[PDB]
Design a binder for this molecule. Structure first.
Ligand SMILES: [Ca+2]
Ligand SMILES: [Ca+2]
Length: 279
């Protein structure tokens, strides 16, 4: 399948070189897989989700996404026009309030919830959890991310937007999950992207067009935008049967475009998420 005039990020993950505008992908498009977007919620009624999204848990008064961040991330994971895995099932877990913030205790609760909830969902091809959030280092938060990963869920987390070593942030610093850095359309590490030995892979994160609340669209930047690209790619590869939740991160790194990125500090991997699609 091919989406012409696609958002640059989608085009980039299906190309060995920057500058293309077509997103090449397999028609399976992640169907059969499930991706939990642990964020500010998802505007499930957005036409772009085609009824494939639904709120499953909220830690606040409402399950509505009154911020937009979660809806944007969910959109990059699997909205029709802006998503990587256009046929995946999206589950929203609102651990962040409408201002985009949340305490570690509920973020941890949200992760433990997904580890359990997946047991009563029909996700034949696998379960992915996309966490475009984080804060200062916390062994408890890292432990929660490790538990979720250990439970059989492919956990993708944002590296952080502090242009610093991700070792000081959580859950970014948990070695067992998939920590995602951001790049821009010219293959440069995004100026705000964290780096370091703990990063596993890079994904498009600058000027990413996706869904927004109120049935709209918006372009924003952040490792928060790069994360859903790899979470969606994982769901996509899993329904394709190329990898499993336990080894998806390693598989993505093994098959990534290598050495394409500029301004990558020594010690940080120079790997860019790539779907290796060939028609
Ligand atoms: Ca290249
Ligand atoms: Ca890792």
């Amino acid at each position: 399948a091919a989406q012409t005039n696609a958002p640059w990020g989608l085009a980039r993950i299906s190309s060995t070189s920057p500058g293309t505008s077509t997103y090449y992908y397999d028609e399976s498009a992640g169907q059969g897989s499930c991706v939990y977007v642990i964020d500010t919620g998802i505007e499930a009624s957005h036409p772009e989700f085609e009824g494939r999204a639904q709120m499953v848990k909220t830690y606040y008064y409402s399950s509505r996404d009154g911020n937009g961040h979660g809806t944007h991330c969910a959109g990059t994971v699997g909205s029709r026009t802006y998503g990587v895995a256009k046929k995946t099932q999206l589950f929203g877990v609102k651990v962040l309030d409408d201002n985009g913030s949340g305490q570690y205790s509920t973020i941890i609760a949200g992760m433990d919830f997904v580890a359990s909830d997946k047991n009563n969902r029909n996700c034949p091809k696998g379960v992915v959890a996309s966490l475009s959030l984080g804060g200062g280092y916390s062994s408890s938060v890292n432990s929660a991310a490790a538990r979720l990963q250990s439970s059989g869920v492919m956990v993708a987390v944002a590296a952080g937007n502090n242009n610093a070593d991700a070792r000081n942030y959580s859950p970014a610093s948990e070695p067992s999950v998939c920590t995602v850095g951001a790049s821009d359309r010219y293959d440069r590490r995004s100026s705000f992207s964290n780096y370091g030995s703990v990063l596993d892979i890079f994904g498009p994160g600058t000027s990413i067009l996706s869904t927004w609340i109120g049935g709209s669209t918006r372009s924003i930047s952040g490792t928060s935008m790069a994360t859903p690209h790899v979470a969606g790619l994982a769901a996509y590869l899993m329904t394709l049967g190329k990898t499993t939740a336990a080894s998806a991160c390693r598989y993505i790194a093994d098959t990534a475009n290598k050495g394409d990125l500029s301004n990558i500090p020594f010690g940080t991997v120079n790997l860019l998420a790539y779907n290796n699609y060939q028609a």
